[PDB]
Write a protein that binds this ligand. Structure first.
Ligand SMILES: CCCCCCSC[C@H](NC(=O)CC[C@H]([NH3+])C(=O)O)C(=O)NCC(=O)O
Ligand SMILES: CCCCCCSC[C@H](NC(=O)CC[C@H]([NH3+])C(=O)O)C(=O)NCC(=O)O
Lengths: 220, 220
């Protein structure tokens, strides 16, 4: 047994596939020999930088995504639900405030970041709730186990230079790694760096790390 | 024993990811309780129908795809090789005659379709040899085990409207199942039809079929 391998996960709670990748890595983070670093990012920034556009906007792709996630819900046991209203609506509302809030968490209480992220996804991608209003974010944060005082204080820092710059810098790191969308997983292993896109490269990751893939729901 | 589940695989030899999904399904076809049905298709017809564009056209995606295939080569043990800017070259030349030939094979000698398809992929995506000239296609067909006579007889039929139309119809059937690219895999199980896009949905396919996933190289 050697030292743990650092694995960076860049994600945005706006992204349904980011949630799937996030949960698989969280499930493996104390099974595999890895150091999982969560990297809250803005898909908006990545799209702009790369000249890419949200795949779901192409109707053939959007229809397929709804089918795919409905199956993945059961396969991965993550309560992901496609929104009742059109995707364009959720996309248009976006996730700027939520991702700024997750950034403030990472800056001050990174030990809370996994739960705060999960609770935000539970709003937008499970129960089909808003993630743009202050009250919506506070609700997710209290769900994560954050005191009201604690959550309020972080929310207050959403528009501060420190938080705004950190989110921008994390998002550009993803771009420098070659992102055109999210999630991306960056594994630093045996002296090389590998960037993997999507939630469907975790078995390949296990291979690169020399670890055993036991499916998306490993036994505890 | 329950009747085998029909699994349709729509593919184009122009597409390296189609080769990957094809090899995985071929490895499982005598392990899982399935009837694998190969469906020669044209990626260009699917792009047209769906209004999609080849992903490699975006530089960051093209680069990512190049990196991903290089990793998958070892993970899946498939001898893929290509020079810089190869997809740009494949786009131009296309696979029309090759895919019409495979359509003729499917109409008259479907039992030869797997090997003929494999040999064509070996030409374009392993040795980077031509697949547009008649001599090239006949070389693959003979390597696949056809007699010179059988192969030439089939190649003569790519001039026929029946073969030309059948390739178009198969490609349209992919579109009607929701395709915006290739490969797609369509599983008919428990009275339901599920379409999965990509070479990276075979573990989910195993889940849907209630079969055991043993990775991309299942044991003998
Ligand atoms: C608000 C709703 C927006 C929903 C978008 C889908 S998640 C974002 C999207 N990610 C993916 O398409 C991942 C698909 C991949 N196959 C997986 O399984 O994870 C992307 O950045 N795509 C980049 C690309 O394909 O170019
Ligand atoms: C070296 C460059 C190689 C480029 C190969 C393109 S093969 C065609 C392409 N297929 C895919 O992107 C499949 C990717 C998928 N992640 C997989 O693993 O199979 C497609 O129809 N894509 C549809 C889409 O992405 O919109």
């Amino acid at each position: 047994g050697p030292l743990p391998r650092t694995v960076e996960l860049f994600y945005d709670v706006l992204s349904p596939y980011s949630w799937l990748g996030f949960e698989i890595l969280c499930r493996y983070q104390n099974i595999w020999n890895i150091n999982l670093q969560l990297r809250p990012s803005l898909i908006t920034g990545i799209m702009k930088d790369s000249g890419n556009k949200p795949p779901g906007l192409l109707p053939r792709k959007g229809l397929y995504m709804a089918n795919d996630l409905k199956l993945l819900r059961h396969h991965l046991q993550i309560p992901i639900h496609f929104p009742k209203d059109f995707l364009s609506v959720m996309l248009e509302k976006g996730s700027l405030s939520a991702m700024r809030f997750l950034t403030a968490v990472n800056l001050e209480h990174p030990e809370m970041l996994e739960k705060a992220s999960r609770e935000l996804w539970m709003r937008v991608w499970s129960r089909n709730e808003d993630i743009t209003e202050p009250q919506s974010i506070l609700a997710a944060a209290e769900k994560a186990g954050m005191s009201a005082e604690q959550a309020q204080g972080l929310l207050e820092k959403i528009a501060t230079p420190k938080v705004k710059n950190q989110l921008k810098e994390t998002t550009e790191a993803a771009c420098r790694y070659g992102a055109f969308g999210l999630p991306i997983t960056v594994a630093h292993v045996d002296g090389q760096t590998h960037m993997l896109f999507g939630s469907d490269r975790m078995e390949l990751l296990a291979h690169l790390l020399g670890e055993k893939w036991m499916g998306p729901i490993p036994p505890a």
